[PDB]
Design a protein around this ligand. Sequence first.
Ligand SMILES: CC1=C(/C=C/C(C)=C/C=C/C(C)=C/CO)C(C)(C)CCC1
Ligand SMILES: [Cl-]
Length: 174
Amino acid sequence: ERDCRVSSFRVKENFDKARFSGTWYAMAKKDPEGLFLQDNIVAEFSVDETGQMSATAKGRVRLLNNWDVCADMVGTFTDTEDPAKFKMKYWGVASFLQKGNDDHWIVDTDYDTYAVQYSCRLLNLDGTCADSYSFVFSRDPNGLPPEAQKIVRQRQEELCLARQYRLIVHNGYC
Ligand SMILES: CC1=C(/C=C/C(C)=C/C=C/C(C)=C/CO)C(C)(C)CCC1
Ligand SMILES: [Cl-]
């Protein structure tokens, strides 16, 4: 019954880059295919005088055969016609870290408590996502208050992802 076409997904009305700036702690994630950030994930968002949003991110990644490594990433966002939908060019401060360019949607936020992010890297032929990821962020590293949690759960369901998240631990690995 639920519409899981990516083109159907609502995102944050009148998204405000300035209000979104600062530190966001990843509390949960739905993983894409392939190498991804593992845990201890913290993002720092900024916006400059011209209005270009950028970010940095720290987090543990496990390069295969179980090598751990605190990845240190940089992201720059290109605006689209939708104020909450961006193209994110990203890379690591080290050359060998993953680079690429992902859709970056702010699905919902209240700016001072929670944010829900979404990226579809590849569509299915029916308009659903073949390869997605999603972060839930909190301003407080100790987690969301119940009212925000309940909103986030609704957004998770709307993205057709609600069963597919895992919690992210923060234990000082970085
Ligand atoms: C950059 C960046 C983001 C995603 C970064 C990613 C996905 C990094 C992946 C790194 C890997 C896989 C390293 C292993 O080589 C998110 C969406 C958190 C917003 C904050 C800025
Ligand atoms: Cl569930």
